[PDB]
Amino acid sequence: KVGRLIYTAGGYFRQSLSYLEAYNPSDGTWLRLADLQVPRSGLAGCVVGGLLYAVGGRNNTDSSALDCYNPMTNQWSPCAPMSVPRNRIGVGVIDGHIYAVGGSHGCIHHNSVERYEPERDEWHLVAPMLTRRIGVGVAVLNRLLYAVGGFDGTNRLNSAECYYPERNEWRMITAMNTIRSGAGVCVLHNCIYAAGGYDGQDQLNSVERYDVETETWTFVAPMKHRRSALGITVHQGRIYVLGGYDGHTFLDSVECYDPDTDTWSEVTRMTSGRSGVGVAVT
Numbered sequence: 001k002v003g004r005l006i007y008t009a010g011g012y013f014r015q016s017l018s019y020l021e022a023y024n025p026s027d028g029t030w031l032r033l034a035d036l037q038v039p040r041s042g043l044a045g046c047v048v049g050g051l052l053y054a055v056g057g058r059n060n061t062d063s064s065a066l067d068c069y070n071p072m073t074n075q076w077s078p079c080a081p082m083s084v085p086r087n088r089i090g091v092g093v094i095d096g097h098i099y100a101v102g103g104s105h106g107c108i109h110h111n112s113v114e115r116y117e118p119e120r121d122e123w124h125l126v127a128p129m130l131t132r133r134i135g136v137g138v139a140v141l142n143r144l145l146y147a148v149g150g151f152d153g154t155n156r157l158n159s160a161e162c163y164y165p166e167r168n169e170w171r172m173i174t175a176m177n178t179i180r181s182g183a184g185v186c187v188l189h190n191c192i193y194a195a196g197g198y199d200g201q202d203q204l205n206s207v208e209r210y211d212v213e214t215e216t217w218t219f220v221a222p223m224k225h226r227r228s229a230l231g232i233t234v235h236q237g238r239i240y241v242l243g244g245y246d247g248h249t250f251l252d253s254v255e256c257y258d259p260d261t262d263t264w265s266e267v268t269r270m271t272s273g274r275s276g277v278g279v280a281v282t
């Protein structure tokens with residue numbers, strides 16, 4: 001069997017893409033899957049019940065689209081769209097529900113947040129963030145959604161806030177050491193990781209993880225390639241970053257961070273360089 005792959009949807013390189021490819025870290029092999037009905041970039045990926053969802057993005061135009069991919073049918077299926085278009089959206093999953101955080105619709109910078117129930121194919125607004133954030137990293141940890149960095153329309157941000165589903169409220173948390181938009185955010189071993197991003201003048205290769213109990217952000221081993229608008233995911237206790245923009249070119253490099261050795265390896269290259277891809281694991 002081919003159990004658990006890293007899926008990449010959409011992206012940008014000279015134009016919005018429709019590519020859907022999968023990577024087998026047991027293999028080193030790539031798989032070409034069904035193209036997206038509409039090419040998109042700046043979207044987010046997540047998994048719920050073994051289906052892969054592609055949320056938001058822009059087609060070259062800002063998308064409110066939610067689309068479902070079934071790995072067993074290799075087929076894409078449209079879902080109820082969001083209430084608003086959300087370019088540079090962040091996404092997280094709590095109890096089988098997809099939270100769409102922030103993003104832009106043209107020049108509107110959203111601080112709003114909606115929740116999608118796959119059981120009912122319905123979207124509902126939840127409490128809005130304290131800060132408008134596009135290009136925001138999103139991570140779920142102890143059933144709490146975290147919104148990290150991004151751009152509020154005026155300032156690139158280093159702040160972070162925390163949404164509480166049971167109370168339906170947001171609370172700021174400790175700010176990061178660096179301003180980061182278009183960063184990869186994920187959760188590896190009870191910690192939130194924030195890799196790369198763009199600090200307003202440079203693409204970053206730095207990496208800080210947040211310890212919730214100590215409330216502090218500490219830097220860790222940096223990546224080899226500066227990159228923003230990167231895909232990120234966690235597979236078997238390791239972080240994977242995919243593609244992105246380094247300020248000049250569109251990367252195809254996929255680096256793998258080992259927490260037990262605090263080291264970034266290059267483990268493969270995408271079939272072509274791209275940025276703004278959605279990434280998930282199933």
Ligand SMILES: CCN1CCN(CCC(=O)Nc2ccc(S(=O)(=O)N(CC(N)=O)c3ccc(N(CC(N)=O)S(=O)(=O)c4ccc(OC)cc4)c4ccccc34)cc2)CC1
Nearest residue numbers: 012041042058087088135151181182198228229245275276
């Ligand atoms: C128009 C005139 N020019 C001038 C220069 N050009 C340079 C050549 C070029 O094409 N770069 C390029 C790079 C990337 C894409 S993208 O697909 O990933 N993408 C598209 C999307 N869906 O919006 C996105 C763009 C910007 C983002 N950022 C958040 C933010 N507020 O900018 S960011 O922090 O990471 C950033 C900031 C400054 C940077 O340096 C300028 C580069 C990154 C995105 C964040 C998340 C997801 C997609 C993003 C697309 C194009 C091109 C065109």
